[PDB]
Structure formats: structure tokens, C-alpha cells
Amino acid sequence: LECYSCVQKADDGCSPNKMKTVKCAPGVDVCTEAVGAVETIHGQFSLAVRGCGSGLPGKNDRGLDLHGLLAFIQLQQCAQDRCNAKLNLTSAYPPNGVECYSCVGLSREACQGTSPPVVSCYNASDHVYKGCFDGNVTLTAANVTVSLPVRGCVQDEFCTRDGVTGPGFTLSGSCCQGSRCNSDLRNKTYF
Ligand SMILES: *[C@@H]1O[C@H](CO)[C@@H](O[C@@H]2O[C@H](CO)[C@@H](O)[C@H](O)[C@H]2NC(C)=O)[C@H](O)[C@H]1NC(C)=O
Ligand SMILES: *[C@@H]1O[C@H](CO)[C@@H](O)[C@H](O)[C@H]1NC(C)=O
Ligand SMILES: *[C@@H]1O[C@H](CO)[C@@H](O)[C@H](O)[C@H]1NC(C)=O
Ligand SMILES: *[C@@H]1O[C@H](CO)[C@@H](O)[C@H](O)[C@H]1NC(C)=O
Structure with missing residues (x-):
């Protein structure tokens, strides 16, 4: 069994002419395709992993709100x-007082401390x-995990981890x- 293999983070990686074709290990009978979308009130990006998979055929789709x-x-x-190239790799209010750092597809190399831009919440x-x-978004499939930082405005000021x-x-x-x-909350603690 041959499967597309590629990783998107959150960029060019699963484009047609960088998708690779690998052959699955003996015993493996499915390709996998996973696309994860994150949307904040200022932008939206997607992560993807295509690769060789496990278990049976199937579908598993969930929309979440944090x-x-x-x-x-x-x-x-x-x-x-x-067969794992079917999914799309793609998806006026007034300001309130608060402004947050926004990472919606910035690299982890680019999203740190005071470096990212600022968005006026609403x-x-x-x-x-x-x-x-x-915080962060992570996607795991085909025995590889891809992750990017996430920063923006939210309906809660008091959540911790x-x-x-x-x-x-x-x-x-x-x-x-x-x-x-939200310059850097990894130290925040706890419960
Ligand atoms: C979301 O992602 C990263 C991991 O990719 C989180 O964790 C830090 O990772 C570094 C190594 O990459 C470790 O040395 C640190 O100890 C981790 N931090 C903590 C608090 O355990 C990152 O912290 C996550 N985002 C947030 C906002 O915590
Ligand atoms: C997403 O899929 C729809 C069909 O389901 C298609 O019309 C649309 O062009 C796709 N989006 C992109 C960016 O290719
Ligand atoms: C949104 O926040 C602004 C503060 O700039 C406030 O005037 C407005 O009433 C808020 N809207 C709601 C629905 O609470
Ligand atoms: C998953 O990836 C790790 C790191 O590349 C490797 O050590 C391990 O053998 C892999 N396992 C499978 C089942 O592909």
C-alpha cells in the first residue's frame, strides 16, 4: 500500500508537488489524512498530516470551542x-479596551514574548x-506530531492550563x- 506523506505547519507542506509517496509497512492497510483548523477572532490557520496509518478505515471529525x-x-x-489526499487544507465590530498578542500561524520560531503583533479585541x-x-495546538497522525503556538483574545480571563x-x-x-x-504564560499555576 502506497500513501501520500506530507506535513503542514501551517504552510506549504502538503502542496501537490511536495507531497511524497511512501510505502506502508507490512500489516498496515490504511492511509491517514488529518487536517486541523484553528480560528481566532483575528485569523485562522490549519495543520495537516498525511501518512501511513493503522486500524481500520473510518472517519473522525470534531469541532471544538475553548x-x-x-x-x-x-x-x-x-x-x-x-487515497489520503481528499481533504481541503483550507477552511465590523468596535474594539473593546483590551489588546492581546496574536499568533495564528506564526512559527514557534516567530511567536515568543513581545515579538508577535497586537490585535484589538472585540x-x-x-x-x-x-x-x-x-497556548498551543498539536496534531498527531501517521506516527508524527506537528504543533504550533496559539495566541489571541478569548472569552475568559481566568482559565489556567x-x-x-x-x-x-x-x-x-x-x-x-x-x-x-499573554506575553508568556507557561509559568501560570494552578487549578
Ligand atoms: C505549547 O507547546 C510547547 C511544546 O511544543 C509547550 O511546552 C514547552 O516546551 C519546551 C520545549 O519545547 C519545554 O522545555 C517547556 O518545559 C514546555 N513548557 C512547559 C510549561 O512545560 C508550550 O509551553 C505550550 N504552550 C504554553 C503556552 O504553555
Ligand atoms: C474545498 O472543497 C470544495 C468542495 O468540497 C471546493 O469547492 C473548494 O474549492 C475547496 N477549497 C480549496 C481552497 O481548494
Ligand atoms: C463589548 O465590550 C464593549 C467594551 O468596549 C462594551 O461597550 C459592550 O457592551 C460589550 N458587548 C457586550 C455584548 O457585552
Ligand atoms: C514512530 O516514530 C519514531 C520516531 O521516528 C520511531 O522511533 C518509531 O519506530 C515509529 N513507530 C512506528 C510504528 O512507525
């Missing part, structure tokens, strides 16, 4: 070779967005109050 961050993950496994969809969030999970998927981090407080 304090006003939206995630959508799709996981597809099929048994015809080169209560989109009538929910109030006055917290800042520092929160998360949602989907199949091979986590979105997790911490909240804070005060403009530009």
Missing part, C-alpha cells in the same frame, strides 16, 4: 492506495472577549487579564 477559540479537526483513513458574536490566551481534545488533537493553554498579558 473559551472562544474554534478548532475543527478532520481525520480520514482509507484503504486504496494514494466581542464578536455578542460574547465578551476580554482575556488573552497563550485549560484545553480541549479531539482525536490526535489538543488545543490548550492559559488565560490572563490585562492588555498584552
Whole structure:
């Protein structure tokens, strides 16, 4: 069995002419395709992993909400070779007082401390967005894991080390109050 293999983070990696074709190990009968989308009130990006997989064919799709961050993950496994290229790798309010650091597809090399840009929050969809969030998104499939930082505005200022999970998927981090407080929350603690 031959499967596409590629990784997107969150960029060019699963494009047609960089997708690779690998042959699966003996006993493996499915290719895998996983695309994870994260959407904040200022932008949206996607992670993907295509590769050789395990278990039976099937589908596993879940949409999640962490304090006003939206995630959508799709996981597809099929048994015809080169079949894991079906999924898309693609998806006026007034400002309130607070401004947060925003990483929505910045590299982990690029999203650190005070380096990322600043976005003026706004209560989109009538929910109030006055917290800042520092955290991360991870996707695991085909025995590889891909992860990027996530930063932005959220409907909660008081969450500490929160998360949602989907199949091979986590979105997790911490909240804070005060403009530009999500410079670095890895120290925040606890419960
Ligand atoms: C989301 O991702 C990273 C991992 O890719 C989190 O963890 C840090 O990772 C470094 C190594 O890459 C470790 O040395 C640190 O100890 C980890 N931090 C902690 C607190 O354990 C990163 O911290 C996550 N995001 C947030 C906001 O915590
Ligand atoms: C996503 O899929 C739809 C069909 O389901 C297609 O019309 C659309 O062009 C796709 N998006 C991209 C960016 O290719
Ligand atoms: C949104 O926040 C602003 C603060 O700039 C406030 O005036 C407004 O009432 C808030 N909206 C809701 C629905 O709470
Ligand atoms: C998964 O990847 C790790 C690191 O490359 C490797 O050590 C391990 O053998 C792999 N396992 C499978 C089942 O592919």
C-alpha cells in the first residue's frame, strides 16, 4: 500500500508537488489524512498530516470551542492506495479596551514574548472577549506530531492550563487579564 506523506505547519507542506509517496509497512492497510483548523477572532490557520496509518478505515471529525477559540479537526483513513489526499487544507465590530498578542500561524520560531503583533479585541458574536490566551495546538497522525503556538483574545480571563481534545488533537493553554498579558504564560499555576 502506497500513501501520500506530507506535513503542514501551517504552510506549504502538503502542496501537490511536495507531497511524497511512501510505502506502508507490512500489516498496515490504511492511509491517514488529518487536517486541523484553528480560528481566532483575528485569523485562522490549519495543520495537516498525511501518512501511513493503522486500524481500520473510518472517519473522525470534531469541532471544538475553548473559551472562544474554534478548532475543527478532520481525520480520514482509507484503504486504496494514494487515497489520503481528499481533504481541503483550507477552511465590523468596535474594539473593546483590551489588546492581546496574536499568533495564528506564526512559527514557534516567530511567536515568543513581545515579538508577535497586537490585535484589538472585540466581542464578536455578542460574547465578551476580554482575556488573552497563550497556548498551543498539536496534531498527531501517521506516527508524527506537528504543533504550533496559539495566541489571541478569548472569552475568559481566568482559565489556567485549560484545553480541549479531539482525536490526535489538543488545543490548550492559559488565560490572563490585562492588555498584552499573554506575553508568556507557561509559568501560570494552578487549578
Ligand atoms: C505549547 O507547546 C510547547 C511544546 O511544543 C509547550 O511546552 C514547552 O516546551 C519546551 C520545549 O519545547 C519545554 O522545555 C517547556 O518545559 C514546555 N513548557 C512547559 C510549561 O512545560 C508550550 O509551553 C505550550 N504552550 C504554553 C503556552 O504553555
Ligand atoms: C474545498 O472543497 C470544495 C468542495 O468540497 C471546493 O469547492 C473548494 O474549492 C475547496 N477549497 C480549496 C481552497 O481548494
Ligand atoms: C463589548 O465590550 C464593549 C467594551 O468596549 C462594551 O461597550 C459592550 O457592551 C460589550 N458587548 C457586550 C455584548 O457585552
Ligand atoms: C514512530 O516514530 C519514531 C520516531 O521516528 C520511531 O522511533 C518509531 O519506530 C515509529 N513507530 C512506528 C510504528 O512507525
